[PDB]
Design a protein around this ligand. Structure first.
Ligand SMILES: Nc1ncnc2c1ncn2[C@@H]1O[C@H](COP(=O)(O)OP(=O)(O)NP(=O)(O)O)[C@@H](O)[C@H]1O
Ligand SMILES: O=C1c2cc(F)ccc2Nc2ccccc2N1Cc1ccccc1
Ligand SMILES: O=C1c2cc(F)ccc2Nc2ccccc2N1Cc1ccccc1
Ligand SMILES: Nc1ncnc2c1ncn2[C@@H]1O[C@H](COP(=O)(O)O)[C@@H](O)[C@H]1O
Ligand SMILES: [Mg+2]
Ligand SMILES: [Mg+2]
Ligand SMILES: [Mg+2]
Lengths: 309, 300
């Protein structure tokens, strides 16, 4: 590992301020980092694991943590630091905009086709990067995509489930039945995630008990077409849910298809009031970026630095 | 022709000043919040409210300059982000919580090592060189006019402001030709750079302390210069003294300065002699990756 990537924190260095929420494995807090010998308090997100862990368990966590800290893509969150208290605490960048699911729900009457397609493209790019890095997520869902700015979303919480090993309604059939997790299983989760966005944050299979999901999937039942979706979008979602995992789309393919659609969004999504929705603008984008989202957003191949000696 | 997309024109409704951070010759600086339309998140910003109200005709001039200020693109130069054409004009830029370098060095007077000091010198030279490349003269380079993004990363600020608005006069930082003839050039900026380095090397001491400002050009004309700081090896002092040569063209160029300081930054304890330097905190990759990820994601 490159160890310098993951900061090992003293307990004295940071403080938990307010619970943001809880998930399967821990509780996430808004918090502050207090650099030693400095006056400044820097906002951070802190996760505290639910169960206390032994040193040997901690070693496993730490070793995985180095890999999580090694990610470098604009569409993927990086794990920044760890504090090895009895109950392990982890540190990452704080996203004031919160998770994408909460955002789409909160903005459900004010989100247009351009943003939705753009997010689909971005999530694919992030997932593609994880695939290239041989990292399986296992918990991709709308709750697990963070909004850096409304124009910029990032994948989060990859690797956590394997480490501390159930989001049944996001899981590929082979995963539920046999505990097989692959990139192709992540693709299934991606389809569900897109369905969540397209429905402005509806719950999938709402009212159907999780224990019963594998049964319906086996009979060929799937999530229905969201009203805003043309068949072109819905067909991709259906492909994500094919039984033959190798038959599902690749993230690399998804990036291209969603990118094509994003060039003519109203052709592909039919949304009430779309004609009057806010669209991402350069002056606006440049402003957000200059203030609090400075990272290079270009694909590696399109970056100024790609070929620059 | 500046890309106007680089400067955001703000409505007074978009943002608000929340707290005073400091002040300068031309305005007062606040911590502010920008609230994006249709959002509930508040985004911290820095806002400078100009001291004097301006006309609509003057505002065109300010605005014209602002486009230029917005067009800078260098890791060591601050970029103007936005403007609001209120009766007293307000300008917006990124909040830098660490404040200015001069205050920082004064506050950390007893725990700053040679590596940081030399690195700051290099970075300031880099921003100045960039300003030169852009054909921009600062006119007010000083340690107070360098902001700290993180302790490892500093950025030049307030370039062009004095030319735009000026009718306070930093005599103790000014090249002789500037004092005598109001001539400002990249080369006069170089003189100011030398003073700025002296400020850092003294941990924020005041240049020419005990000498009134009206008397400075006299002493300069007679060959007096700022003394060697006790931490500086003669090698460092020679570069500073070069910055203050009467003949502006004899003075080093920023691009030269980048090279000399970078050399020194390679073996810092050779060039600066600091008590307990061996025990001072050093910039480390770990501290740097964490700081960058939290608060300094710009390409370097
Ligand atoms: N870096 C972050 N910044 C701001 N909010 C965050 C951040 N990370 C997580 N959250 C929020 O914190 C809460 C908890 O996250 P989390 O523990 O991952 O549970 P979850 O996403 O709801 N379910 P799951 O990830 O499947 O276990 C959620 O409200 C998240 O939206
Ligand atoms: O919780 C983890 C985590 C913990 C772990 F031991 C292994 C993998 C993980 N995935 C992950 C991957 C990339 C970024 C962040 C995370 N986060 C979320 C988070 C961390 C810290 C604070 C709040 C939320
Ligand atoms: O105040 C200016 C400024 C105003 C102006 F009308 C002309 C040139 C300027 N220089 C400058 C150049 C590059 C970046 C920032 C600035 N800043 C500092 C600042 C601006 C806005 C808020 C706080 C501080
Ligand atoms: N972008 C900024 N972020 C935080 N503080 C700033 C910023 N700009 C200026 N300041 C502070 O305000 C003081 C005066 O600014 P100025 O008027 O430009 O001289 C500086 O010394 C800093 O303390
Ligand atoms: Mg969790
Ligand atoms: Mg989560
Ligand atoms: Mg001022």
């Amino acid at each position: 590992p490159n160890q310098a990537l993951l900061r090992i924190l003293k307990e004295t260095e940071f403080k938990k301020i307010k619970v943001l929420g809880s998930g399967a494995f821990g509780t996430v807090y808004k918090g502050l980092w207090i650099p030693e010998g400095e006056k400044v308090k820097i906002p951070v997100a802190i996760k505290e694991l639910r169960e206390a862990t032994s040193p040997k368990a901690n070693k496993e966590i730490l070793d995985e943590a180095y890999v999580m800290a090694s990610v470098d893509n604009p569409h993927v969150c990086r794990l920044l630091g760890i504090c090895l208290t009895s109950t392990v605490q982890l540190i990452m960048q704080l996203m004031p905009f919160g998770c994408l699911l909460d955002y789409v729900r909160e903005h459900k009457d004010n989100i247009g086709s351009q943003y939705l397609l753009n997010w689909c493209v971005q999530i694919a790019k992030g997932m593609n990067y994880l695939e290239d890095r041989r990292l399986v997520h296992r918990d991709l869902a709308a709750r697990n995509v963070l909004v850096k700015t409304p124009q910029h979303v990032k994948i989060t919480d990859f690797g956590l489930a394997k480490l501390l090993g159930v989001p049944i309604k996001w899981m590929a059939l082979e995963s539920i039945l046999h505990r097989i997790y692959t990139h192709q299983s992540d693709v299934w989760s991606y389809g569900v995630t897109v369905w969540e966005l397209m429905t402005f944050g509806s719950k999938p299979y709402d009212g159907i008990p999780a224990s019963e999901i594998s049964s319906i999937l086996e009979k060929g039942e799937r999530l229905p077409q969201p009203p805003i979706c043309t068949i072109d979008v819905y067909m991709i979602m259906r492909k994500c849910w094919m039984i033959d995992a190798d038959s599902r789309p690749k993230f690399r393919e998804l990036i291209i298809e969603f990118s094509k659609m994003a060039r003519d969004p109203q052709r592909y999504l039919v949304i009430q009031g779309d004609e009057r929705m806010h669209l991402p603008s350069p002056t606006d984008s440049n402003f957000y970026r200059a203030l609090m989202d400075e990272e290079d957003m270009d694909d590696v191949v399109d970056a100024d630095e790609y070929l620059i000696p």
